[PDB]
């Protein structure tokens, strides 16, 4: 999390946390209720977001391995969408993209190239998922969620 | 002028112990200057001058 980042930054200089790092830590822990609320919204609406994003994404990309008549491929794509929503919820909880980056971004291109899933299609699906997810967030809540969706999309492309 | 005593490195204080170191006719219409009304600042200026 961001707390780990502050601790490691302090440890790199072999010193106690500086006032700036303590201020960042306090600002982060001040927003825990909001982060938990956002994660709860993401968890409760995960399947609805997946369904709406899948509908939009299959409208945008008709010839994709998910929409190719294979039920297992469709199920795997929708599970991937759910997993990425879960990772974004983790990142919202942690205050940084570290959980999402460590779980579903490092080596994402290699994994999806091995699976023969075109990365442009996944970027489009992430775009649709982001549009569906941001509609359930208030204006003050959408900054981090949109940033983490953008992080996934940038890692894929 | 005041001498600068006890400057660092002078040996005035031994160690980190600092307590034991102690123990013609005037021109026409000339008007004199009143010291009290002239002020301390201007008087110091004049005397140092």
């Amino acid at each position: 999390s961001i707390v780990t980042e502050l601790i490691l930054n302090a440890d790199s200089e072999s010193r106690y946390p500086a006032p700036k790092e303590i201020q960042v830590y306090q600002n982060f822990v001040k927003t825990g209720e909001q982060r938990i609320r956002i994660a709860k919204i993401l968890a409760e609406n995960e399947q609805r977001i997946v369904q709406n994003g899948s509908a939009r994404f299959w409208e945008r990309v008709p010839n994709t391995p998910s929409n190719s008549g294979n039920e297992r491929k469709t199920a795997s794509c929708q599970r991937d969408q759910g997993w990425y929503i879960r990772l974004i919820a983790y990142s919202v909880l942690a205050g940084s993209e570290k959980p999402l980056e460590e779980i579903g971004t490092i080596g994402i291109k290699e994994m999806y190239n091995n699976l023969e899933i075109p990365l442009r299609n996944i970027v489009e699906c992430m775009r649709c998922l982001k549009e569906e997810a941001l509609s359930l967030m208030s204006e003050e809540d959408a900054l981090e969620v949109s940033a983490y969706f953008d992080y996934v999309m940038r890692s894929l492309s | 002028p005041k001498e600068k005593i006890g400057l660092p490195g002078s040996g005035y204080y031994v160690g980190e112990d600092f307590l034991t170191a102690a123990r013609d006719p005037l021109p026409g219409g000339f008007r004199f200057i009143n010291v009290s009304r002239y002020g301390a600042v201007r008087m110091k200026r004049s005397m140092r001058d």
């Binding site: 601790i7 106690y16 830590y25 938990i36 919820a89 983790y90 909880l93 | -």
Partner: protein
């Protein structure tokens, strides 16, 4: 390393599952305790040298460990012990601020017993010093924060055992 939030996230992630309500409650506990943890970290950082001085005075000084033939004999070994106590204090502060003991396990207690045994460093004396450090910090910060830091001090002492 790992902190409380990352610990809960990794616990939920190994199951492919969101944070269950118990984990969300624990996360709320950590978020509420964050300000106290910051206060404790600031206090411990301000008096680190004083804490180590008091620890050494009340647990190691004027014993057989500083006499010739003891492990704190010679200035090099005294300085090594002092910097070891400094490491223990700083990384206990790190663990307290993070809310998790993983940093202690991966930075402090990573083969530390083997190193101490090979060098002849007394494990019992080090454990006594850690207990004295915990008592000193508890006197410095208070009761609740004292026991919060003592959790990680006791973790270090247990790891040395």
């Amino acid at each position: 390393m790992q902190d409380a939030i990352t610990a809960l996230i990794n616990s939920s992630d190994v199951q492919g599952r969101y944070l269950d309500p118990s984990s969300l409650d624990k996360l709320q506990n950590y978020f509420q305790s964050g300000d106290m943890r910051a206060k404790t970290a600031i206090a411990v950082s301000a008096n680190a040298k004083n804490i180590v001085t008091k620890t050494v005075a009340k647990s190691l000084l004027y014993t057989d460990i500083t006499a010739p033939g003891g492990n704190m004999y010679t200035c090099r070994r005294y300085a090594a012990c002092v910097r070891d106590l400094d490491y223990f204090l700083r990384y206990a502060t790190y663990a307290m601020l993070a809310g998790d003991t993983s940093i202690l396990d991966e930075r402090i207690l990573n083969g530390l017993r083997e190193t101490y045994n090979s060098l002849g460093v007394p494990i019992g004396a080090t454990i006594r010093s850690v207990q004295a450090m915990k008592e000193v910090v508890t006197s410095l910060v208070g009761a609740d924060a004292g026991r919060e830091m003592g959790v990680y001090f006791d973790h270090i002492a247990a790891g040395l055992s």
